[PDB]
Amino acid sequence: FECPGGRLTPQQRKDIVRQNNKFRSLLIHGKLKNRNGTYMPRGKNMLLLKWSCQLENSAQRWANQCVFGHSPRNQRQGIGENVYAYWSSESVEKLRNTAGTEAGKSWWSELPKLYKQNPSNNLTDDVARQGVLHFTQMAWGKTHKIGCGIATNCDGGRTLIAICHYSPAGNMLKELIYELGEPCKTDSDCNTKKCAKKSGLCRKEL
Ligand SMILES: *[C@@H]1O[C@H](CO)[C@@H](O[C@@H]2O[C@H](CO)[C@@H](O[C@@H]3O[C@H](CO)[C@@H](O)[C@H](O)[C@@H]3O)[C@H](O)[C@H]2NC(C)=O)[C@H](O[C@@H]2O[C@@H](C)[C@@H](O)[C@@H](O)[C@@H]2O)[C@H]1NC(C)=O
Ligand SMILES: *[C@@H]1O[C@H](CO)[C@@H](O)[C@H](O[C@@H]2O[C@@H](C)[C@@H](O)[C@@H](O)[C@@H]2O)[C@H]1NC(C)=O
């Protein structure tokens, strides 16, 4: 959680990772409702997210622009991107320390508010069209790397922007968001061959 030249604190990085992994674990344990009021299906092989300084560096470069939008495609090759902003009429400095976790709650909130019952867990065109792509990237079983950048100087210090980058990039159409199964109990349950038993998520390093 130490990233040379970074503008985040170690704690911010940890809070972001711990929150997103908690979400993932709650999800694969069947504890989270979709828009229809029905629990999402239990999952297996959901990777445990690791912080990547490389990802933070690209996300931070974009956050520094103070633009509420995506970075250009050619700077996002192989990489997912989620964008969050908070617009105040006063200073946002007090919001910096929870920027990442507020952003994760906002992206993640797509599940209960916009994500209709999808039993196959397949990311079809009709599922994608709902605007659940921020949530689906945070939930993407194959993604295992996350890095985020934050700007609080935007609009005279009155706008907060948080940018998170994910690798590998999630949201490939016609692939499942995550595999249907049981959370890992032992290493051999995981295709990566290492299981985080407390969370039921599979470990994948870097
Ligand atoms: C997610 O859901 C989509 C929509 O059903 C799956 O794609 C569909 O796969 C079917 C076969 O599993 C395709 O059927 C074929 O249709 C052609 C058209 O003539 C026939 O010639 C052929 O013999 C089959 O009957 C179906 O067309 C296809 N849907 C579309 C519009 O693409 C998808 O399955 C996955 O993607 C497809 C493209 C293949 O790679 C499948 O093997 C693969 O499982 C579902 N995704 C997942 C991960 O389940
Ligand atoms: C989730 O809620 C929506 C809106 O209330 C319903 O349309 C879904 O049931 C639907 O059943 C038919 C009409 C068809 O639209 C189907 O695609 C939907 O599933 C409901 N989902 C379920 C599975 O009950």
Residue numbers in the entry: 17 to 222
Provide the authors' original text about this structure:
Recombinant BmVAL-1 was produced as a glycosylated protein using a plant expression system. All 206 amino acid residues have ordered main and side chain electron density maps, of which 36 (17.5%) fold as beta strands, 59 (28.6%) fold as alpha helices, 11 (5.3%) fold as 3–10 helices, while 100 (48.5%) form loops. The overall topology of BmVAL-1 is an alpha-beta-alpha sandwich, in which a mixed strand beta sheet is sandwiched between two helical/loop regions. There are five disulfide bridges in the BmVAL-1 structure (19–69, 82–170, 164–180, 200–211 and 206–218). The last two disulfides stabilize a unique carboxyl terminus extension that is made mostly of loops. The two predicted N-linked glycosylation sites of BmVAL-1 (N52 and N138) are glycosylated and the branches have highly ordered 2Fo-Fc electron density contoured at 1.5 sigma. Some N-glycans with one terminal GlcNAc residue (MGnXF3 or GnMXF3) were also detected. The glycosylation site at N138 is within the caveolin-binding motif (CBM) loop that is required for sterol export. The overall structure of BmVAL-1 is a prototypical CRISP-type SCP/TAPS protein that has two histidine residues which coordinate divalent cations located in the large central cavity. The central cavity of BmVAL-1 has a volume of 2567 Å3 which is larger than other single CAP-domain SCP/TAPS protein structures including Na-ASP-2 (1824 Å3), Pry1CAP (1591 Å3), GLIPR-1 (2000 Å3), GAPR-1 (1303 Å3), ves v5 (2048 Å3) and tablysin-15 (2263 Å3) as assessed by PDBsum.
Brugia malayi venom allergen-like protein 1 (BmVAL-1) protein was discovered as a highly expressed transcript representing ∼2% of cDNAs from the mosquito-borne infective larval (L3) stage, and at lower levels in subsequent post-infective mammalian stages. BmVAL-1 belongs to the eukaryotic CAP (cysteine-rich secretory protein/antigen 5/pathogenesis related-1) or SCP/TAPS (Sperm-coating protein/Tpx/antigen 5/pathogenesis related-1/Sc7) superfamily of proteins, which has been implicated in biological processes such as reproduction, fungal virulence, cellular defense, and immune evasion (Hawdon et al., 1999, Ding et al., 2000, Gao et al., 2001, Zhan et al., 2003, Schneiter and Di Pietro, 2013). Immunologically, BmVAL-1 is a major target of host immunity with >90% of infected B. malayi microfilaraemic cases being seropositive for the recombinant protein, and evidence from mouse models that the antigen induces a strong T cell response. Similar to VAL proteins from other filarial parasites, BmVAL-1 has a single ∼15 kDa CAP domain.
